[PDB]
Amino acid sequence: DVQVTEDAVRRYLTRKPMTTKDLLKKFQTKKTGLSSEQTVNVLAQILKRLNPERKMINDKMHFSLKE
């Protein structure tokens, strides 16, 4: 079984800045097992718990964490 955790999303943020929309699709390419709707609810709650920072790149809003 495959599950989504804060560490998963945080891993991407630490590497490169990504947007909320990008994060969603990020968990679409790989078979998560859970419905797309479920990912939205979890992704929306997970992000809040992680409390990622907000950055403006190329006139766009992106999220990036600084370990």
From Swiss-Prot:
- Localized where? Nucleus
**UniProt induction comment:** Up-regulated in response to enterovirus 71 (EV71) infection.
Q: What happens to this protein after translation, modification-wise?
A: Phosphorylated on Ser and other residues by TAF1 and casein kinase II-like kinases.
Q: Where does Zn(2+) bind?
A: E53, H62, E67
- Which parts form a coiled-coil structure per UniProt? none
Spell out the family assignment given in the record's similarity comment: Belongs to the TFIIF alpha subunit family.
Instruction: Indicate the quaternary assembly.
Output: Heterodimer of an alpha and a beta subunit. Interacts with GTF2F2, CTDP1, TAF6/TAFII80 and URI1. Interacts with GTF2B (via C-terminus and preferentially via acetylated form); this interaction prevents binding of GTF2B to GTF2F2.
The free-text function statement in the UniProt record for this protein reads: TFIIF is a general transcription initiation factor that binds to RNA polymerase II and helps to recruit it to the initiation complex in collaboration with TFIIB. It promotes transcription elongation.
Q: What is this protein called?
A: General transcription factor IIF subunit 1
| Annotated source species | Homo sapiens
